[PDB]
Every structure is written in structure tokens, then in C-alpha cells.
Amino acid sequence: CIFEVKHEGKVTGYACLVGDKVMKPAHVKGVIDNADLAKLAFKKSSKYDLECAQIPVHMRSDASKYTHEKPEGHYNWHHGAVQYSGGRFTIPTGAGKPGDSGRPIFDNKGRVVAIVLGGANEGSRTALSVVTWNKDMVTRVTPEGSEEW
Amino acid sequence: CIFEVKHEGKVTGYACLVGDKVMKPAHVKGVIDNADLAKLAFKKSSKYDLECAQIPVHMRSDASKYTHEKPEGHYNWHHGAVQYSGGRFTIPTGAGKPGDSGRPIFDNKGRVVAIVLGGANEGSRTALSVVTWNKDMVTRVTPEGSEEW
Amino acid sequence: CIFEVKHEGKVTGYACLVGDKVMKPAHVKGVIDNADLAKLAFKKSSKYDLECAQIPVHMRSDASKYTHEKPEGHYNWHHGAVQYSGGRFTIPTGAGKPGDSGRPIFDNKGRVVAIVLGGANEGSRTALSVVTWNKDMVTRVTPEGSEEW
Amino acid sequence: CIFEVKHEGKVTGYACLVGDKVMKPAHVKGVIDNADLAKLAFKKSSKYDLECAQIPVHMRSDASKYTHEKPEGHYNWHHGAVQYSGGRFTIPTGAGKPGDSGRPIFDNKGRVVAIVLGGANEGSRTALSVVTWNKDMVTRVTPEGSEEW
Amino acid sequence: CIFEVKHEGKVTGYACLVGDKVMKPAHVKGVIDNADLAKLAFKKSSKYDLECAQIPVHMRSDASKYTHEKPEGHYNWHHGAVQYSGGRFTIPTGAGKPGDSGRPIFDNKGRVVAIVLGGANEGSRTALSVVTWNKDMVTRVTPEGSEEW
Amino acid sequence: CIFEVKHEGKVTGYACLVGDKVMKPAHVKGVIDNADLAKLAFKKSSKYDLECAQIPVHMRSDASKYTHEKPEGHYNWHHGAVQYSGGRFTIPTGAGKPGDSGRPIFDNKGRVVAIVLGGANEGSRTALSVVTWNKDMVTRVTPEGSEEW
């Protein structure tokens, strides 16, 4: 699902294929380093800091699954764990640096629970700024003091 | 895309297949360690410190994509990041040593933003000497004090 | 046998399939991260801090074996050893942190001897709070000063 | 010759096939982790801290040779050397910890000279408690202050 | 070729099958830990500190080859190198400890050039006491200050 | 190509099969540790510190290739790199100790560029004494202060 969004040879973020859409955090500079994906029609929402595009048939096989079911506990991401409690995601400050946008936070069954956009460093833990689902909806949860990765 | 250019058993640089051409920095000693590629007709420009050759049909599948879209920000390369600002690329002095020619600097979507030729060490940062694109053109940006890798 | 019980993306404990039932410590927040298991009919006992459910035919193959035969000596668990003496289980303080509920303590032949619920830290050793068997019965042994993991 | 004697997944000692019998130190908890060997008829002597069983034809090939010829000097064991003098075996304190029962002490020609049961730590050297041969007999030599391994 | 000579469970030296004979340094206590070899007729020479026995047909396949051709240079042994110069063998003091008798020193083609009996520690180098060949003869070279291993 | 030249069990140098001849530095004591090679007719030149012999048909397959093409740059040898500039070879003082004669210095394509005979230690770099080719000739380059390895 993760496809990197390059900008003049510099990887600036990522783009996941979640379900039937190709998502990419709007704030991220650059184009998707996949020919087919770059050529698509992207719709941009500044509200959700998103910029999605409906996936082509031949890529739907590589499309990941998403979910709203996000019980308190621990999740997985590129940089290890993600504590999830209080409708809030957190990672140990320093695991996520800029350039980590568009990465998915998934459960142990693979399902994508949310997509990182940035994070508010609050001591030992950074409270992640995310794009999450909600009973057939796409919400956006963002903490005060949040940077954009 | 990267194919190493050997010289008497010593790897002296690299050669990327960007788009429909096989590029290789002219200054680099040796031949490409790929049978098919070595046998091609190479045209050499001393202006761009380049020596390209139009890719054979069977290798076009392994051909990478390139781009002029290079917004300020961060890029990826073999040795980590590449700061890109002021129409200038930079890496932390010491990441790129000689023998790193022909390596591509790409964005997060894979697209090749530029190709390293060498670099001018200016303290903590080395300003890279590169071959970059420009709205259907191949330009060459090189800083004063530049060595050839 | 171990299946993790997630709560909003945060793993809060575990659930083992011991024999013909699927056990889970009642105190644990969340749902079992296995589709089939979540959908079952769970009966809850506050007496035993348990919440079991009779296993479906297709999962009985992955069902572990249990036993009352627990002679003094050493047992195995996720975090190494477990001293067992005086009808009491103990682990070196610090091996078991919260989030370790529902984990089994087994013998060298695989049989599950007990299931952790929490533990009373008493110096170098923590005396474990467990669910154990007893000649075709399910007992619960818990020490004073016990926390819930 | 060495076959480990497991007890609830915990290796508690060993069992060697010396000559035509399968020996095992009686004090050791558990069963032999070899199907065929477990099923045999074991005779137990509390005098010699032994529990032998006459070897099956198909295993006699893997049966080791034993000997009474034990001249003063050095012997081999799992944990290096064994000083042998004064009708006494010794190893540097700390080489043999509990769980080392049933291991053989052999000569440079392979012959098994004795079988460890435990040992009396007497400073830098521990004087081993052993089962040894004696002109077609099985004797047992044990020092004061001996533990059982 | 190497077969260990055990003494009451303590390995005291070794025995190599060189050519058509089974050699063993006479000074070594114990019996050969190979049934067939122990049962043979051994002839002992105190002159050569040897005790050879003509090899049985079924073991001749595992018999090693020997040679008198020993040009100055380096040889191989269990404990690395062996300098050979001045009709003298040497190893760095400390490579060979007692219990290393009967070990062969061979060339890069496998041929056994000599058999260790002991050695005279003379500083950084120990000059080995050996049994060597000499145009269809078995000689014995031994340095002043030699111990027996 | 490299075959070691032993002397009384002590490896004193080497012998490479370069092209159609078997070369060996004349100064080296001992015989080649290869039966077939030892039996050949060797011609010795004191001028070139060489002692070559025309290779037998069955060994010509294992014969290496040589070359006069030696452009300034870096070469390979047993002990790493070899700087080559000013018609001179050099290695960092200490890489080549005595006993390194007859070793080849080759290019990245395998071709043997020269054969070491010894070297003049001149500080941090030792300027190698070599046997090199020259448009269908065998020359010998040797620096003042050269030892023989």
C-alpha cells in the first residue's frame, strides 16, 4: 500500500492504497513514484489534509484493507509501536521524524487503523496527528502543538 | 536502474536507466557490469559530464522514471537524505565519498530527481554537483570547489 | 492458543484456547483480534476473573492442552521462568508488566498449568495471581497486594 | 549415548547408553526424550543412585563403550577437563551446575570412565560424585558435601 | 586418523592411523576409545616414545597418508600453525598444552609430516618434540627442556 | 593460479600459473606443493628473480590470464589494495610481510598485472619489487632498499 511521494529526488512522504482509494496527505510536496498513480485524478480536501484518488482495477489487488474498529491497545507502524488510548495515538518521541507522512498505523491482522500526517511532541510521548475512520466516514484527529511530517 | 561501472575489478561509479536512456557520468573509468549495456552505442557530452545510450526493449521494464518537479524539501539517496533548497542539493559532509557517481537522488514516489556526479565540501554540508532535469531538458548544476566522485 | 485482546488499537491482554474453551480474563478491556472468536457467546465469572467461551470445531485443532498436575519446580512462560512452590507461582519482579494477562504458564510438555491475571510485587519476586486447574475444576489463586495486568 | 531426561519441558538431566544398558541417575525427575527408551523396563537402585534398562537391538549401534581402566590423569567431559587422582574426580568449581547429571566423563579413546550424579564444591575444585566401574562391577563414589545435579 | 586415548573418562592424548599402522605415543595413559583398535596387538618402543599396531583391513580406508618430504615452511595442526625450519618444528608457546600427544602435524595436501609427543617451551616459541619420517624410517626429534603432553 | 611453495613444512612463498607458464620467484626456498608441478622442467633467470616452467595441458584450464595494460589506479592483492602510480606499485607498509612472494596483483577483471617478489619499506608506504609485463615481454621493477619476501 505504501508508495513514496518524491520531490526532486527527495522522498518527502508516502501514499497508501486503502480499500478502493489511493490516499496521500495533501500537505506533502512531490509526486507519487509510481507512473500509473501519478496520472490519476486527485481530489483534495484541506479539511482532512488529504488528497485521495480512486484506485485503478489492476492495482486493487495490492490495495490494503482499512477499519474503524480501533480498541484501546497497541498498534503497529514502521517505527514500532503506537499506544492507542483516549481516542489518541502516541508513539515514543523520536520514532517519527518529518517525512513520515502517509504511513499507515495498522492492527495485528493487517487492517489499516489510521494514516499519519504529523505529530505534537509532548515530552516522552508524541501524540500523533492522524486520519482515521469512523463507521463509514474519514475523520481527522489532530493535537495542539502538531508539526507536519 | 543502478548498474555499477567496474574498472579492473574496482567499482568506480554507477549507471542508472532513467526513462528510455541509460545514463552514465562521462568522467567515470570502466565499463558497465551488464553484458547487454556494455555493447550499446554511447554518445558522450563533456558539457553535462554525461554519456547516455538509448535503452533496449527488453530492459525498458527495469527502466526508472524521472522528473523535473523538484520542490524544496527532502529527497532520498543511497546515503540517506539530501536537502534541496535554493536550486541546490546538499548532503551532510561525509555521506558521499568518491565512487558515488551515477547514483540517483529520488523523491518519495520513486521518480529520479537528479543524478550525482560529485560534490563541493563546504563545512558540515557538501553541495552536490548534479545532472538534473528542466521541463524536457537535461541540465547540469555544479558548485565551486567540486570534486568528482 | 494465545490470541491478543485489542482495545482501540492498544493490546491490553491475551486470550488462550485451553482444551475446548476459549478463555479470557474478564478484567481485560477490548475485543479478541480474531473474527471468529469475537463473534462467540461469552459467559463471565467475576469470581474467577474469567470470561470463557466454548471453542468452534474448526479451531479445536489449534486448541492447547491443560493440566492439574503441577509439581513443585520450574515452569515456562513468555518472560522466562516461573518458580512454583507452596501452591504459589512467582516470577522475578519485572518480567511481568501490565498487559500480560491471559498468558499461559506451561510445563515442558506443552500442557497449560495456569493462566496469569496479575501479580503482587513482593521484593525480588512477584507472586503471580493465577487461574489454575484442580482435578476437573478451575480455581483462582491470588496474593495480597495483587495488581491486574 | 547422551539422551536428555525432560520434565515438563524442563531438561533436568541426561541418560547415556553405556554398553548394553541404558543408564539414568535415579534422582533425576522426568522422562527420557526418546520414544523407544521411555517405553523400556527400568530397574532402580537407590544404592547407586542409578536406574538402568537393557538396550534394544536397534539402538545397540549407538551404544557407547565403558571401562574400569582409569589411570590418574585427565579426562574429558562436556565442560572441559576432569582431574582424576586419588580415586577421585574433580572439575574446576563452576563447570558443573545442576542439570548435569547422567553426563559421561570419558577418556581420549572414547571409553566412558564414569557418570556424573552430582558434586561437592570444596573451594576452587569440586570433587565429583560419580558412578564408576570396577573389574566387572558398578561402584559409586561420592564425596562429603555433595549436591545432586 | 585421530582417535582419542581415554583414561578413566579423562582424554589423555590421541592415536592416528598413519598408512598401515595405528600409532600412539607410548607415554600416554589410557586406552583407545575405539573398540576394534583397543583389541589389537601393540608393539612398544621406548626409543621412539611410540606404541604402534598394524591396521585392520576395514579401517585402512580411514587411514591417513604420511611423508618424509618436509621442506622448510609452514604446517598445519589442531592449534594452527607450526613453523618448520632447521629440522625443527615450533609453535607459538601456549598453543599446545598437555593432552596434545598423538596429534598429527600435516601439510596442505593432507600428508602427515610428523606426530607430536611433547614440547620444550623456549620463550615465545615452543620447539616441538616429534616423531617424524626419514626416507622409509621413523625418527624421533626431541629438544632439551621438553615436557610430555 | 596460486600454488604454495613449501620448504620442510614451512610455506615460504607461492607459485602462480600465468597464461601458459608456471611462474615462481627464483629466490624462494622449497618445492611446489603440487605433485604435477614439482615434476616439471624449470628454467631459472637470476635477472628477473624468476624460475618459470611451461604448463601441462590438464592444468591450463586453471591457468590465469595476464596483462600489460596497467593504468594508474588501484589494484587487488591478497592483502587488500595496491596503489599504482609512476610505474610503481605500493601497499601500506605492513600488509606484505616475508612469505608473500609469488602472489599476484590483479585488476578488477581478474587479469594478473604483476607478481610480487619483495618490497622497499619507505615509511607509510612500501614500494613493491615486482615482475610485470610490457607489450609481450616480462620486465622486473625493483626499488632501492628492497627486501625479499
Contact E71 F4 (CB under 8 A): no
Using CA atoms, how far apart are residues B33 and B13, in angstroms rounded to an integer? 11
Of B114, B138, B101, the closest CA to residue B5 belongs to B101
Judge whether E48 and E140 are in contact, CB under 8 Å: yes
Residue F10, SS3? strand
Nine-digit cell string for B137: 531538458
User: Vertex F38, ends F37 and F41: CA angle to 5°?
Assistant: 85
Contact between E105 and E82 (Cβ < 8 Å):
yes
Return the C-alpha cell found at A89. 495515538
Q: Do chains F and B touch (3 or more CB pairs under 8 A)?
A: yes
Residues of F with Cβ-Cβ distance to B11 under 8 angstroms:
108
D78: phi then psi, degrees, rounded to nearest 5:
-55, -45
Name the residue in chain C with its Cα closest to that of A113.
C9
Rg (CA), chain F: 14
Buried/exposed F46-77: b ≥16 CB within 10 Å, e otherwise: eebbbbbbebeeeeeeebeebbeebeebbbbb
- Active-site residue flag, F7: no
Method of determination is cryo-EM
Q: Are F95 and F65 in contact (CB under 8 A)?
A: no
Question: Which is it for strands A10-15 and A3-7: parallel, antiparallel or unpaired?
Answer: antiparallel
**B82, β-bridge pairs:** B75
Nearest CA in chain D to C112: D8
Which of helix, strand or coil describes residue D29?
coil
Q: How far apart are CA E106 and CA B113, in angstroms?
A: 61
| CB spacing of C74 vs D11 below 8 angstroms | no
DSSP D51-119: EEEEPPGGGGGGPBPB-S---SEEEEETTEEEEE-SS-EEEETTS--TT-TT-EEE-TTS-EEEEEEEE
Residues of A with CB under 8 A from a CB of B: 3-15, 28-35, 37-38, 98-99
Q: Do chains D and E touch (3 or more CB pairs under 8 A)?
A: yes
Interatomic CA distance for residues D67 and D14, integer angstroms: 19
Local structure of residue E34 (DSSP, 8 states): S
Distance of alpha carbon C17 from alpha carbon C2, whole angstroms: 7
Per-residue DSSP letter, F136: S
Burial F90-103 (b: 16+ CB within 10 A, else e): bbeeebbeebbbbb
* Pairs of residues, one from chain D and one from chain E, whose beta carbons lie less than 8 Å apart: 122
**Among F4, F8, F33, whose Cβ lies nearest the Cβ of E85?**
F8
Q: List the one residue out of D100, D67, D72 whose CA is nearest residue D84.
A: D72
Taking Cα atoms as reference points, which of E74, E137, E119, E142 lies closest to residue F8?
E74
Residue A122: partners with Cβ closer than 8 Å, 6 or more residues away = A93, A143, A145
From the list C64, C99, C100, the residue with the least C-alpha distance to C82 is: C100
How many angstroms separate the Cα of E7 from the Cα of each of D128, E22, E116?
16, 18, 19
Residue-range domains of chain A with CATH? 1-64 (2.40.10.10), 65-149 (2.40.10.10)
Give the pairing of strands B21-22 and B17-18.
antiparallel
Q: Assess contact for F67 and F113: CB atoms under 8 A.
A: yes
Give the separation between CA E5 and CA D106, rounded to whole angstroms.
9
**Which of F65, F77, F108 has the highest number of chain B CBs within 10 A, making it the mutation to test binding with B?**
F108
Instruction: Choose the catalytic residue: F36, F101, F124, F136.
Output: F101
- For this experimental structure, what is the resolution in angstroms? 9.0
Closest C-alpha to F3, from E107, A92, B64, D58: E107
DSSP secondary structure string for all residues of chain A: --EEEEETTEEEEEE-EETTEE---TT--SEESSHHHHTS--EEETTTTEEEEEPPGGGGGGPBPB-S---BEEEEETTEEEEE-SS-EEEETTS--TT-TT-EEE-TTS-EEEEEEEEEEETTEEEEEEEEE-SS-EEEE--TT----
Query: How far apart (Å, rounded) are the C-alpha atoms in residues F80 and C140?
Result: 68
Locate E17 and state its grid cell: 592411523
F46 in catalytic set = no
Contact F109 B8 (CB under 8 A): yes
| Burial call C66-84: b when 16+ CB within 10 Å, e when fewer | bbeebeebbbbbeeeebbb
CA distance F137 to chain E (A): 32
- CA distance readout (Å), E66 to B110, C16, F80, F142: 64, 65, 36, 41
Q: What is the largest CA-CA distance in chain C?
A: 45
| Helix, strand, coil percentages for chain C (3-state, nearest 5) | 5, 45, 45
Q: Which of the residues E36, E64, E100, E101 is marked catalytic?
A: E101
Q: How far apart are alpha carbons C118 and C99 in whole angstroms?
A: 9
Q: How far, in Å, CA of A39 to CA of A41, rounded?
A: 7
Residue E35 to residue D52: CA distance in whole angstroms? 22
Alpha-helical (H) ranges within E73-132 are none
Q: Which three cell numbers stand for residue F34?
A: 603440487
Helix (H) or strand (E) holding E38, with range, is helix E35-38
- Cβ pair A31:B69 closer than 8 A: yes
Interchain CB distance below 8 Å, E73 and F31? no
- Distance between CA atoms of D62 and A41, rounded to whole angstroms? 73
D91: β partners: D126
Question: Residue D31 to residues A12, A23, D12, D27, D42: CA-CA distances in angstroms?
Answer: 61, 59, 9, 12, 11
CA A59 vs. chain centroid, Å, equals 19
Please tell me which residue of chain F has the smallest CA distance to E88.
Answer: F8
Taking alpha carbons only, the member of D114, D46, D42 closest to residue D77 is: D114
Give SS3 for F126. Answer: strand
**DSSP symbol at E141:** E
* Angle at alpha carbon of residue D121, lines to D115 and D125, rounded to 5°: 85
List of residues 6+ apart from A105 with CB closer than 8 A: A75, A76, A77, A82, A89, A112, A113, A114, A115, A116, A128, A130, C9
* Cβ neighbours around A91 below 10 Å, total: 22
E strands of C8-147, at which residues? 10-15, 17-18, 21-22, 31-32, 43-45, 50-54, 73-77, 80-84, 89-92, 104-106, 112-122, 125-133, 138-141
Question: CA E146 → CA C5, C90, E75, E99, E123, distances in Å?
Answer: 72, 58, 20, 14, 13
Among chain E residues, CA nearest to D107: E6
Reply yes or no on whether D146 is catalytic: no
CA distance D50 to A124: 60
- Cα separation of D126 and A4, whole Å? 64
Assess contact for D77 and D83: CB atoms under 8 A: no
Q: At CB < 8 A and 24+ separation, what contacts does D51-54 make?
A: D51/D23, D51/D24, D51/D25, D51/D26, D52/D21, D52/D22, D52/D23, D52/D24, D53/D21, D53/D22, D53/D24, D54/D20, D54/D21, D54/D22
Task: Return left, alpha or beta for F42; rule: phi > 0 is left, psi -120 to 50 is alpha, else beta.
Answer: beta
Instruction: Please count the residues of chain A.
Output: 149
Q: Which residues does residue D89 pair with via DSSP β-bridges, in sequence order?
A: D84
Contact D6 C110 (CB under 8 A): no
The grid coordinates of residue F128 equal: 613493491
Say whether E29 sits in a helix, a strand or coil.
coil
Q: Which residues contact B57 (CB under 8 A, 6 or more apart)?
A: none
| DSSP summary character for residue E61 | G
Q: What is the largest CA-CA distance in chain E?
A: 45
Residues linked to residue C79 through DSSP beta bridges, in sequence order? none
Contact F10 E87 (CB under 8 A): no
**D130 has which bridge partners?**
D116, D141
H or E segment to which residue F120 belongs: strand F112-122
